């Protein structure tokens, strides 16, 4: 309908204005108190912090510039911040501040206290089809938005989907997201979710995000992913074969949608045909979904996470607490000039 077309046209206008003139240097480290490490990886970490003047809580992602360079992530970290400061959608975590110093890059996001979807999935075992479908509809709308801005997300998995105070999803981690007209070539993403054309080192497009939504819906409704194996090479052989086995408890409508999203031939995959996202939105598995009501946040969620207030960390796990050290000398200034 024209209403959807005009919504996506305005979304692209507003994105391009911020894309062409990015904000920079909007806070500094000593405006915040450090509370707790919420997650740690090979070149960065995420910390709960409190702003000292307002008392508001935020999630601060800290990237070590020297490790970014060594792990070949310069372009990816510049993509992440430039895209996050330009997007606006109900199911995307909001960037509030960004800045850099002699040692680190910082992105200060809204803090979502209910934790990762992955923790709730593993606690309950699997989600019922109605519960899986409520989350899946939020991902379909978010990919419709991102793809219309020529963005590919490239890191869909349950650890990157946080559950908010109303039980809705907020997508975090734009470290692999990129603006792409046509094809792109980088090998990136988590093994269990990679589409075959990425594993085969082909030039690929937004169809890899719709493959990864098939893997996500399978894992939500089964409790484990479709292509599981002990080592990555074994996973990759299963993926490129595309042989999938479905639990008997899956509905016939869920199996049919999954066979069309987990289609090895990218030119036959739902989301990448002439009708685009509408082949997914109009599939029988989504017949009960009110797409406008989901966007408007008017549907009652399947569950609300248990937490005590905006500073509660009980839905995230425990990590060794390390210093946030800042060198007396500037590192890698040229590489990160635009940040
Ligand atoms: O704490 C938040 C959170 C994020 N955004 C808003 N609210 C909360 N985590 C913690 C776990 C997750 C996470 N992602 C990471 C990426 C790189 C390195 C470490 C990471 O740990 C998101």
Characterise this structure.
The protein is of the alpha+beta class and 339 residues long. The chain has two domains: 4-21 and 116-306, Transferase(Phosphotransferase), domain 1 (Orthogonal Bundle); 22-115 and 307-337, Phosphorylase Kinase, domain 1. The chain is 33% helix and 14% strand. The chain is built from eleven helices and nine strands. It has helices at residues 2-20, 65-70, 74-84, 117-124, 129-148, 196-199, 207-222, 232-241, 252-261, 278-281, 291-295, and strands at residues 32-40, 44-51, 57-64, 95-100, 104-110, 151-152, 161-163, 169-171, 178-179. A five-stranded antiparallel beta sheet has the order 1-2-3-5-4. Strands 6-9 form a two-stranded antiparallel ribbon. A two-stranded antiparallel ribbon has the order 7-8. Bound molecules: the ligand O=C(c1cncnc1)N1CC[C@H](c2nc3ccccc3o2)C1. The ligand O=C(c1cncnc1)N1CC[C@H](c2nc3ccccc3o2)C1 binds next to strand 1 and strand 2. Residues 32-286 form the Protein kinase domain. It is a lipid-anchor. The active site is at residue 155. It is found in: Cytoplasm; Cell membrane; Membrane; Nucleus.
In short:
It is found in: Cytoplasm; Cell membrane; Membrane; Nucleus. This protein has 339 residues and is of the alpha+beta class.
List keywords for this structure.
Transferase(Phosphotransferase), domain 1, protein domain specific binding, two-stranded antiparallel ribbon, Phosphorylase Kinase, domain 1, 339 residues, alpha+beta, 2 domains, binds the ligand O=C(c1cncnc1)N1CC[C@H](c2nc3ccccc3o2)C1, globular, 5-stranded antiparallel sheet
